[PDB]
Write a protein that binds this ligand. Structure first.
Ligand code: HEM
Ligand SMILES: [Zn+2]
Ligand SMILES: [Zn+2]
Length: 153
């Protein structure tokens, strides 16, 4: 798991995200969809977006990026004790949206990339390592719930 020093790194970086939730959210979803256009196919809501310029122009996509980062932030702030927050998310993503764990890996890479792009000075390799560990813990706990419900992978 994460050391206290590592949680400190994660939580101090997150405060920088909270200074511009919509901007980070929009950048992360666009990075995901450009890097892995197969992920776009899971969203009936967005699958009509064919080009990067169309994604940037979508107010609805920006709104969902706020939804995603708000939910992720609430989880990170629980410092590993996130069972009540994580369970409804695992439920809906396994049983309704049908999102494979690999796509959670892809969005984790997108988050790291955008944090680096927006915060090149402050987001050094130690914070990157710590953020990677936090996102791994998130995936590990979701995967456990997926396995319980008989989805896993
Ligand atoms: C950081 C990881 C993620 C977080 C925190 C997250 C959070 C959420 C939240 C809070 C909702 C709305 C409530 C719900 O339906 O559960 C949602 C909806 C959804 N999510 Fe996720 N999500 C994440 C990753 C993904 C990925 C990687 C995909 C697909 C590749 C995905 C697909 C969806 C879809 C299809 C919906 C329904 C959207 C709609 O039609 O309104 N999510 N997400
Ligand atoms: Zn891909
Ligand atoms: Zn706008």
């Amino acid at each position: 798991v994460l050391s206290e020093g590592e949680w400190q790194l994660v939580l101090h970086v997150w405060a920088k995200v909270e200074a511009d939730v919509a901007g980070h959210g929009q950048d992360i979803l666009i990075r995901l969809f450009k890097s892995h256009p197969e992920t776009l196919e899971k969203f009936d809501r967005f699958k009509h977006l064919k080009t990067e310029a169309e994604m940037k122009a979508s107010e609805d996509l920006k709104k969902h990026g706020v939804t995603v980062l708000t939910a992720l932030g609430a989880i990170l702030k629980k410092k590993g004790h996130h069972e009540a927050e994580l369970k409804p998310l695992a439920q809906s993503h396994a049983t309704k949206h049908k999102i494979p764990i690999k796509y959670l890996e892809f969005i984790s890479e997108a988050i790291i990339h955008v944090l680096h792009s927006r915060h090149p000075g402050d987001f050094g390799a130690d914070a990157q390592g710590a953020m990677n560990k936090a996102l791994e813990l998130f995936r590990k706990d979701i995967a456990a719930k997926y396995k319980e419900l008989g989805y896993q992978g």
